Amino acid sequence: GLSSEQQRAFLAVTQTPHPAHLITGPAGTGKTTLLYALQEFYKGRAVTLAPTGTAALQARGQTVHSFFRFPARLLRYRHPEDIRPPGPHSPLRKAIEQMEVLILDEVGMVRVDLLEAMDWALRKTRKRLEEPFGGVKVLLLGDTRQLEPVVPGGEEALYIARTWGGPFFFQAHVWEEVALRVHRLWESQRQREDPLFAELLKRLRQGDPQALETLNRAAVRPDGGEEPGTLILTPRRKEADALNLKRLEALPGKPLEYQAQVKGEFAETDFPTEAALTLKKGAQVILLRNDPLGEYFNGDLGWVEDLEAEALAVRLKRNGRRVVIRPFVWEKIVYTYDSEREEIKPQVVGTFRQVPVRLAWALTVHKAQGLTLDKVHLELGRGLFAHGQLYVALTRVRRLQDLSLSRPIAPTELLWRPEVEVFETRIQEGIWQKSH
DNA sequence: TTTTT
């Protein structure tokens, strides 16, 4: 059963007709477990989404993009080219028209344009433009001290800056129309058997520099990444590639390389997986795209069973089933202000065809937000770059003995967004309503 | 840098 404070938030959300709620609290407080209780209460009437594939699977839902069929690009504000309602007889329209509750987990990683598109898509599909989210009761769960939304430095950043003032979900203009009720969780459930670890992460969350010095003196163990049962977390994908290639060297399978087809402008830093992707049987991998048939999803973990020319078999950890993987296509979209109109336009400039597979003995910290891991080693690589990155990497485990780091961390590496300090301040009053 | 399709 749930804890005292989780059940209090359960009743606060289900016993009132208010249409917008946020359940928020530190890492491991039980938000997604409370989400489980909400799914069973609501059962068929609620849709569960999340921004990332790993979080969606952790929430037992799907990604926001794949539910609304949003394209993987900047969703311009109420733009018909970007937010397209489903057809008159489509299965998705029936789902949107009948839906009564939308549950959105890991809302801290939902960018502001994504949240605004969900609002507008629901209003347009349900034919209710006057009501926020088209009259659906939205239940948001997440932590703004965890990872900030991903914002590439194109004209996207300028456009998000001009339209909303920043990238976070609480900067959406829909909060000018409806008040967001905030309910808070405080007790760590993940670190419940290790109360001094839980208190260390609390002080780390407040930015305590003695908690960092305590962490460094206790958790810095360079060889910790080679111990069995250990998931390695890195800030960057290229850093995970070099660590994965080391564990792959030790596998006795005969290797096979999967050669990507690249066309047009598509630079290597933008590749979702290596262009010369080499794999062996038994290798640990994560899948990067959703199956059109529904057998696997972006974020599924599993191991390689068979490797053939343009097809391989993967044994999924999620359900112990065997799925066959084929090449997918990724587009590279860029935005130009050309030339002196008052708008920017997206354009496809390159494509990347490759198996949607990547080795997963080491993952990015982004792909780990939401997970409880048995043992983690943080490889700092060339350093942290994202608000909340460090805190997510440290809060995945239940006990301090389950956590190691490749090097000590200086306090000058801690990042803080002032947008999150005003938000965290105002929502202590139990309410968030956006001004102006 | 990172995510989404």
Ligand SMILES: Nc1ncnc2c1ncn2[C@@H]1O[C@H](COP(=O)(O)OP(=O)(O)O)[C@@H](O)[C@H]1O
């Ligand atoms: N009431 C509870 N009793 C026992 N274990 C719990 C409870 N709530 C959560 N957990 C466990 O604690 C861990 C973290 O909970 P989770 O819901 O994933 O927190 P969050 O979503 O805030 O990170 C998971 O292993 C979960 O199963």
Ligand code: ALF
């Ligand atoms: F939702 Al979390 F750690 F905050 F899984």
Ligand SMILES: [Mg+2]
């Ligand atoms: Mg969670």
